[PDB]
Design an enzyme around this catalytic site. Structure first.
Site, mmCIF file in Angstrom:
data_model
loop_
_atom_site.group_PDB
_atom_site.id
_atom_site.type_symbol
_atom_site.label_atom_id
_atom_site.label_comp_id
_atom_site.label_asym_id
_atom_site.label_seq_id
_atom_site.Cartn_x
_atom_site.Cartn_y
_atom_site.Cartn_z
ATOM 1 N N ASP A 110 0.793 -1.229 0.000
ATOM 2 C CA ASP A 110 0.000 0.000 0.000
ATOM 3 C C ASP A 110 0.824 1.278 0.000
ATOM 4 O OD1 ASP A 110 -2.243 1.641 0.044
ATOM 5 O OD2 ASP A 110 -2.348 1.602 2.232
ATOM 6 N N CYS A 140 -9.011 8.850 -10.234
ATOM 7 C CA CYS A 140 -10.209 9.658 -10.011
ATOM 8 C C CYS A 140 -9.848 11.124 -9.816
ATOM 9 C CB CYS A 140 -10.990 9.173 -8.790
ATOM 10 S SG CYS A 140 -12.539 10.087 -8.539
ATOM 11 N N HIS A 239 -33.241 -16.433 13.323
ATOM 12 C CA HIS A 239 -34.672 -16.716 13.271
ATOM 13 C C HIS A 239 -35.219 -16.529 14.679
ATOM 14 C CE1 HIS A 239 -33.352 -20.201 15.444
ATOM 15 N NE2 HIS A 239 -32.495 -20.446 14.470
ATOM 16 N N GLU A 308 -28.418 -23.321 8.431
ATOM 17 C CA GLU A 308 -27.486 -23.525 9.532
ATOM 18 C C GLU A 308 -26.489 -24.620 9.182
ATOM 19 O OE1 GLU A 308 -25.787 -22.306 11.546
ATOM 20 O OE2 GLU A 308 -26.790 -22.231 13.492
#
Ligand SMILES: Nc1ncnc2c1ncn2[C@@H]1O[C@H](COP(=O)(O)OP(=O)(O)CP(=O)(O)O)[C@@H](O)[C@H]1O
Ligand SMILES: Nc1ncnc2c1ncn2[C@@H]1O[C@H](COP(=O)(O)OP(=O)(O)CP(=O)(O)O)[C@@H](O)[C@H]1O
Ligand SMILES: O=P(O)(O)OC[C@H]1O[C@](O)(CO)[C@@H](O)[C@@H]1O
Ligand SMILES: O=P(O)(O)OC[C@H]1O[C@](O)(CO)[C@@H](O)[C@@H]1O
Ligand SMILES: O=P(O)(O)OC[C@H]1O[C@](O)(CO)[C@@H](O)[C@@H]1O
Ligand SMILES: O=P(O)(O)OC[C@H]1O[C@](O)(CO)[C@@H](O)[C@@H]1O
Ligand SMILES: [Mg+2]
Ligand SMILES: [Mg+2]
Lengths: 431, 431
Positions: A110, A140, A239, A308
């Site tokens: 980076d 950009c 749930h 699950e």
């Protein structure tokens, strides 16, 4: 003549006696290089590819104690240039130790790497350590975007600990102007014809991909084209309580209890008071999640991938029963909950591979409500909150609680919201 | 209050009382437009997205009885232009009936569509029928490639039924020169900034992607970046015979029989006499496929996605036992073998979703040997040979037989090779 491993249930031949990659970030500051680096890494590590970010900025913040100003990044700053180069070289040093000595597979470098010179240096580095080189450039020139970016993750950086918006915002602007003169974007049609790279333009508006050397680079490419930055919200919950929950039985496909339905009703009120223009609802194919979604009176979609974890021959059983019936198995699981796979069933590792498509789709969508199961929910949560495979199988994901995940800075912000409805507790620590 | 469907085992609320897309191919002739169209379609239909190709060429070959020469495609050919336009408009007519009246989801418009005018017309068409428009352009000015393409799928076309290579090869070259003057490639940075499109350059060497409106377009994009055209071979076969095969029991994880091992030995001799520079071996995680691969003394990789279909509560059982024990279930399966899902188990439909990643990787690889299971093998084979979901669950994939799939023209060529070793027969027709 093979023998089946006890934990992972994998057949291996009885004994009885993929080149690593360096991802190179490229682009002027405030272009999302670190954002992308972290997210990329979060994902790869999640699907099992050991990745690590090497932010040359931190190496710098390490060597030069406390922050100055944009003068540090001036091309005529002979000394800073020396230090900056030593930072880049120290990071590549740590990269070599990662990819070759630490078992790492992908190393994300980076840095701005805005010059052909710097890039050629990295290529050389890779060429001599037998590493592949994939480049990701972010282009950009939208002042609104750059400006917004400067506000979201710069003005609060540790570098500006002693600055206000007005001044920090100016120092970073000058900082950007420093790299602009010598900045040489990737040229996939000329100087960079042979480099494998992806050029992200206008925050994903357009892409220019060159080559792609393997499936790993293929995935990475797919991922960047699916993530976005528009604000949205992802709610996660299980749930409503169900019969098996009450009996403390795992797996199975039971229906909501009186409380479970009550919770389903509360969830409806919650979604309602969220005032969301749009909202997608995803459930598993098990009865309990569907009954819950039905209470919302909103169109939903079922995913078999959200079912699950499969308990195998232990389905429908209670932990007590397992402990007694399959003692040895009950032990193998407590000692390695992530990799352990139920006989003829799955492991948390299997869930992650099964959920990859869900994660990829969540990145593409805006607001999404996912009603699932305990283990499944842990998996997804581990992805958004970057939780190691060791802690994943133990994250706390209680019944009747909505986890509200929102995008902020470089990661995800989490908010827990218990819908005020009793239910049993299906959580259990290591012992 | 829900009820579980009997066949697919899906919970649906008791009653008791995604805009379609037009894929537009763009490019000069001999650029793989039809190749891509067919493969794209083969894939999409396989993963469940109803797709159909609308080759404007066939509409033409339909209207103008028997073939002339390149004069038909001359811009000054006022009448041909009239007919060609009526062909394009007739095809869009059939497209409207597909996407809006026939339940179709994707319609691939296979034509040169080399002019902005023609494209704008299609856009208009889509705009008025409420269809999305995604463009795929193939650009390649490599004489060797174009030449090779002309040889592989043109010189044998029904148009040249009465021509030899020397003349056919010339007529097509002139045919290409016809479109060249008015050819206006996509301009994603100018005139076409708003169009969602992918430009494939030099047979996948480079890509220029613009936008992407949904996940469906996202997948399509991923697929094109992974398929290739280098010659290679894909061998498919099941594990050597195993104990369960002898007892006629389904599922389970048994080991090779004396014959099964014999077969594994023969397979080794086969691979050996294939003289392949390289070869990858993939197996499932079940014992029988691994034992087989071991006999090759070649490094292999295990995929859980390649495990045989999950028979659910019927695992380890014999069909006779199922017929007796779960009669009603045994019937539900014979009446709908593709969609039928075993209790707590899977359906052929589930296998397809489970195998998608395998298929995507097979497209990326060169030579690959896949040792799997009956149902699994059918699924993969159905993909390469374009077999409907109705015939998939009944394709004949016998034990000890190697299916050799090789790339040819627009599809895959298949060769069966029985390694001369007895074994039971696990095939069973509809009854
Ligand atoms: N492809 C992209 N283009 C532009 N901005 C992007 C982007 N992806 C993410 N961002 C935005 O960029 C910000 C994060 O920027 P980040 O700090 O990663 O930039 P940077 O690493 O380029 C700067 P520097 O080299 O100065 O540290 C966030 O606001 C994020 O939403
Ligand atoms: N992206 C690509 N670029 C160039 N050639 C490709 C390609 N994808 C496939 N091909 C090759 O193209 C051939 C098939 O061409 P196809 O007939 O599909 O072209 P076409 O549809 O452009 C011509 P026409 O409009 O004249 O019918 C095969 O030899 C195939 O290997
Ligand atoms: O990668 P380069 O070319 O050495 O630039 C690195 C510098 O860029 C920054 O991200 C600022 O934009 C610093 O944190 C870092 O020290
Ligand atoms: O992740 P754990 O601690 O193994 O619990 C898994 C179990 O939790 C449950 O959701 C029950 O709460 C079961 O369906 C599942 O088998
Ligand atoms: O799509 P267009 O511009 O009408 O060109 C169509 C013609 O192209 C061809 O594929 C020849 O290249 C013919 O089969 C077909 O009739
Ligand atoms: O596809 P069919 O006809 O249902 O047979 C499936 C069965 O075939 C087997 O491979 C046995 O031959 C079993 O493992 C599997 O359950
Ligand atoms: Mg940064
Ligand atoms: Mg064609």
């Amino acid at each position: 003549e093979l023998t089946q491993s006890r934990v992972q249930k994998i057949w291996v031949p009885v004994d009885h006696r993929n080149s690593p990659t360096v991802i190179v970030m490229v682009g002027l500051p405030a272009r999302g290089k670190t954002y992308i680096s972290k997210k990329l890494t979060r994902y790869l590590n999640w699907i099992g590819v050991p990745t690590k970010v090497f932010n040359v900025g931190e190496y710098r913040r390490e060597a030069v104690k406390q922050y100055s100003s944009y003068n540090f990044f001036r091309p005529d700053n002979e000394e800073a240039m020396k230090v900056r180069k030593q930072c880049a070289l120290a990071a590549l040093r740590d990269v070599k130790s990662y990819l070759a000595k630490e078992g790492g597979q992908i190393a994300v470098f980076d840095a701005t790497n805005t010059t052909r010179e710097r890039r050629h240096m990295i290529l050389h580095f890779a060429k001599e350590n037998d590493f592949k080189a994939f480049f990701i450039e972010s282009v950009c020139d939208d002042p609104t975007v750059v400006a917004s970016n400067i506000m979201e993750v710069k003005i609060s950086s540790p570098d500006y600990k002693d600055c206000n918006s007005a001044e920090a915002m100016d120092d970073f602007m000058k900082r950007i102007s420093c790299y602009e003169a010598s900045y040489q974007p990737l040229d996939p049609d000329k100087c960079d014809r042979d480099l494998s790279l992806i050029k992200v333009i206008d925050v994903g508006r357009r892409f220019l991909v060159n080559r792609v050397q393997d499936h790993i680079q293929s995935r990475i490419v797919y991922y960047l084209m699916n993530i976005h930055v528009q604000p949205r919200t992802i709610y996660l919950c299980r749930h409503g309580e169900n019969e098996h929950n009450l009996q403390g039985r795992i797996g199975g496909d039971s229906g909501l209890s009186s409380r479970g339905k009550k919770f389903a009703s509360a969830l409806s009120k919650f979604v309602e008071e969220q005032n969301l223009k749009d909202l997608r609802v995803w459930t598993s194919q098990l009865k309990s999640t569907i009954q819950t979604a039905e209470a919302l009176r909103l169109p939903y979609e079922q995913w078999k991938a959200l079912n699950e974890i499969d308990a195998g021959v232990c389905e429908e059983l209670t932990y007590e029963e397992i402990r007694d019936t399959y003692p040895e198995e009950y032990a193998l699981r407590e000692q390695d909950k992530y990799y352990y796979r139920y006989p003829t069933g799955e492991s948390y590792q299997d869930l992650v591979q099964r959920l990859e498509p869900v994660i990829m789709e969540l990145e593409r969508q805006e607001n999404v409500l996912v009603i699932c199961h305990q283990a499944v929910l842990r998996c997804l949560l581990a992805y958004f909150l970057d939780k190691s495979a060791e802690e994943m199988p133990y994250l706390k994901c209680p019944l009747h609680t909505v986890l509200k995940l929102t995008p902020v800075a470089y990661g995800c912000r989490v908010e827990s919201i218990y819908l005020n409805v009793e239910s049993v507790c299906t959580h259990r620590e290591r012992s």
